[PDB]
């Protein structure tokens, strides 16, 4: 409607250090969280009930992502590796080795035969899920890579970096197809394609989110009012109800904007530290949010629209 009405339903406690990332499983049943405590935890998406802990990394984890069938997770760690996990058994199926520094971000493609990763070593790597081998190393950026994401059919990858650039890569060739540059190039702390693949949402460390038309190469919308100068905060498109943009903020709030008019429609209060990560449920109007060291909780919020 005019505005959603997200209200706190559950607070999920259990990580002993900052939460780095939260993601809903594509089937809607689960939430996964990753933490600086080196753990992944699985929670019920609808009741917030703790399910299990998945362990194995030697250092903190910056990101987690689900496979399309909701059976696998990939995690990205400061230990310079990714791990692929069988969620039900908890087994580490593969350890993806090859980055020379912290691995910061990760995602499966829609077919889930590939994983993309970005690292502090300034490269983007494409991996084969079955063999666990690296297929390509792209010399993508001249500073740490902050996010990597496949488009809807897996043909393209978007990457962002502290070097101020967003780049679009051909998955099969590894060719850089596009570099997005605005009037200015502050660090880019997050990027993802819109669900329809026509747009890219990019966060920058000047308290600003930008919606780019991908093939026309131009910034169409801008979202402000939040605080984001230090951390790589996730952002989302919310599509189950009203069309929103959702993001954490360094003032401890979750911000929801009307995608089209660009106005703040709600600010969610409850966290006691930086909201680093938000996720939108695939079928219900539910948002998960997660905070840094002084808070350590995950919250599940639900709206009537």
């Amino acid at each position: 409607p005019v505005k959603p009405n997200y209200a706190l339903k559950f607070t999920l406690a259990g990580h002993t250090k900052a939460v780095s990332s939260v993601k809903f499983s594509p089937n809607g049943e689960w939430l996964a969280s990753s933490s600086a405590d080196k753990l992944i935890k699985i929670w019920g998406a609808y009741d917030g009930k703790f399910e299990k802990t998945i362990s194995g990394h030697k250092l903190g984890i910056s990101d987690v992502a689900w496979s399309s069938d909701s059976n696998l997770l990939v995690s990205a760690s400061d230990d310079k590796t990714l791990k692929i996990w069988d969620v039900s058994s908890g087994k580490c199926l593969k350890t993806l080795k090859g980055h020379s520094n912290y691995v910061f971000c990760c995602n499966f493609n829609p077919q889930s035969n590939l994983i993309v990763s970005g690292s502090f070593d300034e490269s983007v790597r494409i991996w084969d899920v079955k063999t666990g081998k690296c297929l390509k190393t792209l010399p993508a950026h001249s500073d740490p890579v902050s996010a990597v994401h496949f488009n809807r059919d897996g043909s393209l990858i978007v990457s962002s970096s502290y070097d101020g650039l967003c780049r679009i890569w051909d998955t099969a060739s590894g060719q850089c197809l596009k570099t997005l540059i605005d009037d200015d190039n502050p660090p880019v702390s997050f990027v993802k394609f819109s669900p329809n693949g026509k747009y890219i949402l990019a966060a920058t460390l000047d308290n600003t989110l930008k919606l780019w038309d991908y093939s026309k190469g131009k910034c169409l919308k801008t979202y402000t009012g939040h605080k984001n100068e230090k951390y790589c905060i996730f952002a989302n498109f919310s599509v189950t109800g009203g069309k929103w943009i959702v993001s954490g903020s360094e003032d401890n709030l979750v911000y929801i904007w009307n995608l089209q008019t660009k106005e703040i429609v709600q600010k969610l209060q409850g966290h006691t530290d930086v909201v680093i990560s938000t996720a939108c449920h695939p079928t219900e109007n539910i948002i998960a949010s997660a905070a840094l060291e002084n808070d350590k909780t995950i919250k599940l919020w639900k709206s009537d629209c």
């Binding site: 250090k17 900052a18 939460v19 780095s20 990332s21 933490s35 600086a36 250092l59 903190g60 984890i61 910056s62 990101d63 760690s77 400061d78 912290y102 910061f104 951390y231 790589c232 680093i276 840094l292 060291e293």
Partner: peptide, 5 residues
């Protein structure tokens, strides 16, 4: 990590 304060 992403959380590094």
């Amino acid at each position: 990590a992403r959380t590094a304060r």
